[PDB]
Design a protein around this ligand. Sequence first.
Ligand SMILES: *[C@@H]1O[C@H](CO)[C@@H](O[C@@H]2O[C@H](CO)[C@@H](O)[C@H](O)[C@H]2NC(C)=O)[C@H](O)[C@H]1NC(C)=O
Ligand SMILES: *[C@@H]1O[C@H](CO)[C@@H](O[C@@H]2O[C@H](CO)[C@@H](O)[C@H](O)[C@H]2NC(C)=O)[C@H](O)[C@H]1NC(C)=O
Ligand SMILES: *[C@@H]1O[C@H](CO)[C@@H](O)[C@H](O)[C@H]1NC(C)=O
Ligand SMILES: *[C@@H]1O[C@H](CO)[C@@H](O)[C@H](O)[C@H]1NC(C)=O
Ligand SMILES: *[C@@H]1O[C@H](CO)[C@@H](O)[C@H](O)[C@H]1NC(C)=O
Ligand SMILES: *[C@@H]1O[C@H](CO)[C@@H](O)[C@H](O)[C@H]1NC(C)=O
Ligand SMILES: *[C@@H]1O[C@H](CO)[C@@H](O)[C@H](O)[C@H]1NC(C)=O
Ligand SMILES: *[C@@H]1O[C@H](CO)[C@@H](O)[C@H](O)[C@H]1NC(C)=O
Ligand SMILES: *[C@@H]1O[C@H](CO)[C@@H](O)[C@H](O)[C@H]1NC(C)=O
Ligand SMILES: *[C@@H]1O[C@H](CO)[C@@H](O)[C@H](O)[C@H]1NC(C)=O
Lengths: 164, 148, 46, 219, 46
Amino acid sequence: YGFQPTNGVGYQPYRVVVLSFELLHAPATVCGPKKSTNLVKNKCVNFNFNGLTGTGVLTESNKKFLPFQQFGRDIADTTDAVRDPQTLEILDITPCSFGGVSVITPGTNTSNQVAVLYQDVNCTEVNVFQTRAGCLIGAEHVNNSYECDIPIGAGICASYQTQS
Amino acid sequence: ETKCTLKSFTVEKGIYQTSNFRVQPTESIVRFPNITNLCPFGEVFNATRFASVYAWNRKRISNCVADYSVLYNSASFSTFKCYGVSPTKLNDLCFTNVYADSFVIRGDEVRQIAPGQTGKIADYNYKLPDDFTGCVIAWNSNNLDSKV
Amino acid sequence: YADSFVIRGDEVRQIAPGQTGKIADYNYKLPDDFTGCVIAWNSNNL
Amino acid sequence: AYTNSFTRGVYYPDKVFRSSVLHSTQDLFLPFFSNVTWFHANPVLPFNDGVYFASTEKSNIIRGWIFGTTLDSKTQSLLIVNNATNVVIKVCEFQFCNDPFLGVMESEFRVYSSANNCTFEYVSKNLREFVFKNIDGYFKIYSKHTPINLVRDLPQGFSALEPLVDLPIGINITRFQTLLALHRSAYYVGYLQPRTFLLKYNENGTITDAVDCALDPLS
Amino acid sequence: SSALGKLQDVVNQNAQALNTLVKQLSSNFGAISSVLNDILSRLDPP
Ligand SMILES: *[C@@H]1O[C@H](CO)[C@@H](O[C@@H]2O[C@H](CO)[C@@H](O)[C@H](O)[C@H]2NC(C)=O)[C@H](O)[C@H]1NC(C)=O
Ligand SMILES: *[C@@H]1O[C@H](CO)[C@@H](O[C@@H]2O[C@H](CO)[C@@H](O)[C@H](O)[C@H]2NC(C)=O)[C@H](O)[C@H]1NC(C)=O
Ligand SMILES: *[C@@H]1O[C@H](CO)[C@@H](O)[C@H](O)[C@H]1NC(C)=O
Ligand SMILES: *[C@@H]1O[C@H](CO)[C@@H](O)[C@H](O)[C@H]1NC(C)=O
Ligand SMILES: *[C@@H]1O[C@H](CO)[C@@H](O)[C@H](O)[C@H]1NC(C)=O
Ligand SMILES: *[C@@H]1O[C@H](CO)[C@@H](O)[C@H](O)[C@H]1NC(C)=O
Ligand SMILES: *[C@@H]1O[C@H](CO)[C@@H](O)[C@H](O)[C@H]1NC(C)=O
Ligand SMILES: *[C@@H]1O[C@H](CO)[C@@H](O)[C@H](O)[C@H]1NC(C)=O
Ligand SMILES: *[C@@H]1O[C@H](CO)[C@@H](O)[C@H](O)[C@H]1NC(C)=O
Ligand SMILES: *[C@@H]1O[C@H](CO)[C@@H](O)[C@H](O)[C@H]1NC(C)=O
């Protein structure tokens, strides 16, 4: 090539690179770039660790995996721990609170007031009274003991007195 | 809700299961491995000694973390052509190998390089196939590679 | 409802209940809960 | 010679941690109380479905294996080597000596005479067990290093093997060999079959015992 | 202090049934996987 700086356009050195890809056999690919995103804590989230996909709340744990072990599971084979691939720390997985809702009625032929029980839910996640059957809203906790009227559970009952 | 689930305008005293309840996911998170292998791409990027056209190089590329997303957004070249998928669809894949051949040609002949072409750099000195995957990138280097 | 138009001869299978394709994904869609007939006949003589 | 394994060749079959439980698996294992060949110091063996491979010494006579279908050119093969430096995995088309080895001056490596078309590279008494398997283009290698208080006889006991290397080596496999360091100045081969086992997991998550469920009526 | 098998058996039966119920959440019944996030990721809605 006869090159010179006073050459016309197109008569300039153009450095060339080409790409040529391989996709025959084998599935062991190094892939390109990912894209992490730090990590919250103590909130119901949709997580994804490497392909492990689920939803729940992640806390820090007191387990100790083996250096090659990447996640844990319990009896009934549900995932209850995980290792995150950048900190090398193992995290507990807990399902995000759920339950049933029951309404306590003194009978519509007597009143329109109701109370509500959120079954086996702590009261923070919903005057307000914590039983062993769940969180109860709209009923006053008196100190006297009557015969059972409407069974709440675990030893607690409710009733329409006097008006409330 | 009681009246709906009991299908009646009157209800009698009792306790009634009416619905379920559950907490909803606040957000989404993703975790993945760092890189452990930034991979090589500078040797051919920044200044460097290139070769002739029949002395076109070759490179078996081993595992590593890609970064095309930067060369795609770079666009500081005369040429960025992939006959194959868009580079938007490229930074999210997993191949076996990519091959890198390098040489320097003139500017008035780069359009001789397309899979299926003619001329002395397509007929001689180099050869593409007709079906193609990869991308071709070229840029002028007259500032450095031409001299008085 | 009579929807009347003209297409390329290839994507006549693109007018169908439930599918993916450059004609079906951008210019005309039918629900998967379709109920009706589709008629096609050739035209380069008009 | 032939010898009897007792409870040998158990590997962790997945990445899953497990606390104090008894977990049942179906996989390719070395059956309990098996008929394992004995070799002294070697020849071309088969592969056919995975391989158990133990070895005993204080020096290092066992210097890796070589795998493949033809162990030559015209088809691809793997090569796993270790000079006195460190491991060298490699995948080319080779030309292998029909009796390949390395010497011990300390000059060596009469192993091959060709290294064409390389598609993968890598560089960097005692009982040393290994389990080699090859599924879906992945060549998996489990291993364990236990210290014997003998020199070169197969002992008795339980010790689970932890996964190590791994890549897309693929390269169809039907045969394999061994590599030894000559004199100039003991190893076994089991095979793996599809069995069903019952693994007992510790509270730290290690496999401490197992049951082969096709040995006898009690099992 | 050194016999309550009839009470132990009703506990065992209930636990053995509740475990069989959960262990069924991981069978295909003739599908491509057992996860809905895997059929909703490599299949179109139809
Ligand atoms: C991923 O990369 C980060 C840095 O980009 C590494 O973070 C370091 O981790 C060590 C713990 O081993 C800490 O002592 C350092 O303070 C961290 N530095 C920074 C800047 O965060 C992390 O270890 C890497 N992890 C992997 C698996 O590669
Ligand atoms: C190639 O190397 C050069 C030199 O190391 C890099 O040039 C630097 O660019 C930054 C940002 O434009 C300037 O602030 C520096 O002054 C430059 N270097 C020098 C020595 O002046 C260049 O960024 C490199 N190319 C790439 C793609 O990374
Ligand atoms: C229900 O209401 C009716 C109509 O007011 C009344 O006759 C009846 O006594 C009530 N039932 C009670 C109080 O149990
Ligand atoms: C409910 O949440 C509170 C707040 O952390 C906690 O102190 C308590 O132990 C939980 N359970 C009950 C039964 O109150
Ligand atoms: C109920 O009695 C207990 C006595 O231990 C007392 O501490 C509590 O305050 C009482 N609650 C009400 C609402 O009177
Ligand atoms: C192993 O099989 C060979 C095959 O002939 C047999 O001779 C030998 O006795 C067997 N060994 C054991 C321990 O069963
Ligand atoms: C060990 O063997 C490998 C095999 O190629 C070689 O690359 C390496 O250089 C050898 N070690 C030394 C110190 O030469
Ligand atoms: C493998 O090597 C042979 C001889 O060196 C060569 O003819 C052949 O082209 C090579 N394979 C490939 C895919 O280039
Ligand atoms: C391995 O050999 C078999 C011979 O039956 C062949 O059919 C198969 O294609 C080979 N493997 C690959 C990945 O080509
Ligand atoms: C491992 O297990 C042993 C015995 O099962 C236990 O004592 C120890 O705390 C565990 N954890 C270690 C050694 O980190």
